[PDB]
């Protein structure tokens, strides 16, 4: 019973956060086995951040220019390399708290947990979605660079996000753990705009099913729609199109509630056209799109 | 808005979760030093759950009737006692992952992180507020009994909530770590109704300060009020009256913005009497009441 934004327990990741410093520049790193991963922006000085030539800056660096602190222990760097926008510091000590882990690149519309950290210390945890325009709407302050996002599946941590920067609209951009940005962004201190964001339609539908499972039905109706006719209306409102795969994924929620997927599409179509008339769904005045069908099933089965 | 419900990192609590089983009744417990804390409901058979005689259920029980497991490893119970609605099981091993900790009883309005657990295994973490009617709008399934709520200040975990039961409306009820229920509930499997809820005034005020901090301040009027006058008006709109402690925890935000607490009460009074008139605050037409003054500073300032 109930439905809330839920993050994975963050303990397995907390044991991996460290602080990395070059000169006066400092951010968070991820210590797995004998490697620390962190944004390569750390090698920038105040004058480099605007337009860094990273290969130039890195070749001028020695191992002892990197100071890595785990708690109050200093870790000795014995090698360094760059993979795209991620710096890899080889250290002489393996992290005994290293969990079983994978690096994955997540798809837009999928969710993950963010462990926000400052100076290598974990500060808070919360759930985010990869937006269709490759930004994330996180909660990050100065010093959060290098914080990571992840999912956990049977004691294996799949790291999918490393935080790099804040955009002028206050949304956030980062890379996978291979150092490739999500979206058309680049790691320099310039004002960067994202593409137009769209709403994750399959997630909104999942969250409507959550609302029904928790006893709210005011938005349901008796109208009918085809998948294509729903997608025409959805595109009009800058909603992502709904695929047959998405319809299939919503299957369990349809079975549970007895509401056909296309019947819930008919309900969403009306909400897009009429609005909510000051009413709320699961306490929200806006249509929530950062719950996947798996997130709803996980919280609402039974 | 840039505001998200953020949990504390859960690792310090994850290392304390265990499963406790009596016969087939099984739930979650909290292992700190050489004591495991858990709801006394675990000693009920199904026929006991409706109207248990705990004293009589406990006199029949011996140490060897309690199965306490960390993962699949059994912890031998060497003493047991009842304190209000919590059972305290003395075990023969001091938990090596015990953090610095305290037991605290919170007030309505205060927020905390919940580590939802099933069979001793943490499943997710999210932020909750204690409602004025002493329920929490959590997210809990069967098997969640004994999950705990907590805050972390510096490196000390303040435990404030242990989950006991779901109410007919789907909200949740439980105790502090001394076994004293929040609210008028008792640990019987009966349909107990929560009283009518109200809005957490101190947290709405914190939210208005957060809006001011971010430059959204159209709602600041030119008036002030006395605390007594504001309290009397607030109750007529199903808002909670303010306490002297409430005024004091608004102090840092009042100092940060230079807006006197009673001036902000006058501004909230005007919103109550007139409404938003089609206009929004931090992008929402709803006033948020589950961010405490500390949450606001935590998310604006760090
Ligand atoms: C408000 N906010 C929200 N998210 C963020 C993340 N973020 C950050 O934490 N730090 C950044 N720049 C740095 C400045 C430093 C000053 N010192 C002494 N050390 C510093 C280290 C960093 Cl990383 N940035 C900006 C930023 C970071 C990048 F990785 C990048 F490629 C471009 C950028 F403009 C930042 O956004 N802050
Ligand atoms: C849907 N939901 C949301 N929160 C909860 C919490 N909750 C719970 O997890 N378990 C409960 N009863 C038990 C049944 C058991 C069956 N087996 C095999 N083992 C069991 C252990 C428990 Cl604790 N309850 C009900 C409940 C638990 C209490 F502690 C109490 F005092 C009164 C109650 F009615 C429950 O609410 N479920
Ligand atoms: C945290 C943080 N880091 C860097 C800058 C950028 N900055 C400050 S002075 C200067 C010119 C070189 O001295 C630059 C690029 C910032 N604003 N905040």
Swiss-Prot record, chains A, B:
Function field? Cleaves the C-terminus of replicase polyprotein at 11 sites. Recognizes substrates containing the core sequence [ILMVF]-Q-|-[SGACN]. Cleaves and inactivates human TRMT1, preventing tRNA guanine(26)-dimethylation of tRNAs. May cleave human NLRP1 in lung epithelial cells, thereby activating the NLRP1 inflammasome pathway. May cleave human GSDMD, triggering alternative GSDME-mediated epithelial cell death upon activation of the NLRP1 inflammasome, which may enhance the release interleukins 1B, 6, 16 and 18. Also able to bind an ADP-ribose-1''-phosphate (ADRP).
Q: Which domain of life is it from?
A: Viruses
Its quaternary structure?
Answer: 3CL-PRO exists as monomer and homodimer. Only the homodimer shows catalytic activity. Interacts with host FBXO22; this interaction promotes the proteasomal degradation of nsp5.
Q: Which residues lie on this side of the membrane: Cytoplasmic?
A: 1-302
Q: Where is the Peptidase C30 domain?
A: 1-302
Q: How is its activity regulated?
A: Inhibited by pyridone-containing alpha-ketoamides compounds 13a and 13b. In turn, alpha-ketoamide 13b (tert-butyl (1-((S)-1-(((S)-4-(benzylamino)-3,4-dioxo-1-((S)-2-oxopyrrolidin-3-yl)butan-2-yl)amino)-3-cyclopropyl-1-oxopropan-2-yl)-2-oxo-1,2-dihydropyridin-3-yl)carbamate) inhibits SARS-CoV-2 replication in human lung cells. Inhibited ex vivo by michael acceptor inhibitor N3. Inhibited ex vivo by compound 11a and 11b.
User: What happens on changing residue 142 to A?
Assistant: Does not affect ability to cleave and inactivate human TRMT1
Spell out the reaction equation it catalyses. TSAVLQ-|-SGFRK-NH2 and SGVTFQ-|-GKFKK the two peptides corresponding to the two self-cleavage sites of the SARS 3C-like proteinase are the two most reactive peptide substrates. The enzyme exhibits a strong preference for substrates containing Gln at P1 position and Leu at P2 position
Q: Where is this cross-link: Glycyl lysine isopeptide (Lys-Gly) (interchain with G-Cter in ubiquitin)?
A: 5, 90
> Which residue spans adopt a coiled-coil conformation according to this UniProt entry?
none
Effect annotated for changing residue 205 to V: In strain: Zeta/P.2
| Protein name, as recorded | 3C-like proteinase nsp5
- Source species: Severe acute respiratory syndrome coronavirus 2
Q: Which residues form the active site?
A: 41 (for 3cl-pro activity), 145 (for 3cl-pro activity)
Q: Where in the cell is it found?
A: Host cytoplasm; Host Golgi apparatus; Host nucleus
């Amino acid at each position: 019973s109930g439905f809330r934004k839920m993050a994975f327990p963050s303990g397995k990741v907390e044991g991996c956060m460290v602080q990395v410093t070059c000169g006066t520049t400092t951010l968070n790193g991820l210590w797995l086995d004998d490697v620390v991963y962190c944004p390569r922006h750390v090698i920038c000085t105040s004058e480099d951040m605007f337009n860094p030539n990273y290969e130039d800056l890195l070749i001028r660096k020695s191992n002892h220019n990197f100071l890595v602190q785990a708690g109050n222990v200093q870790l000795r760097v014995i090698g360094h390399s760059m993979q795209n926008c991620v710096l890899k510091l080889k250290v002489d000590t393996a992290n005994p708290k290293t969990p079983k882990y994978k690096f994955v690149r997540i798809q837009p519309g999928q969710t993950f947990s963010v462990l926000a950290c400052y100076n290598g210390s974990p500060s808070g945890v919360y759930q985010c979605a990869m937006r269709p325009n490759f930004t994330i709407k996180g909660s990050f302050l100065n010093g959060s660079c290098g914080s990571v996002g992840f999912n956990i599946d049977y004691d294996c941590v799949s790291f999918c996000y490393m935080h790099h920067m804040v955009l002028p609209t206050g949304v956030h951009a980062g890379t996978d753990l291979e150092g490739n940005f999500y979206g058309p962004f680049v790691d320099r201190q310039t004002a960067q705009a994202a593409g137009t964001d769209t709403t994750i339609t399959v997630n909104v539908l999942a969250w409507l099913y959550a609302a029904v499972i928790n006893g709210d039905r005011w938005f349901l109706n008796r109208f009918t729609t085809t998948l294509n006719d729903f997608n025409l209306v959805a595109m009009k409102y800058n909603y992502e199109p709904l695929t047959q795969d998405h319809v299939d994924i919503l299957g369990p929620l349809s079975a549970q509630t007895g509401i056909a997927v296309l019947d819930m599409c008919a309900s969403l179509k009306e909400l897009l056209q009429n609005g909510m008339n000051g009413r709320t769904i699961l306490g929200s005045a806006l249509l929530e799109d950062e719950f996947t069908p798996f997130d709803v099933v996980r919280q609402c089965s039974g």
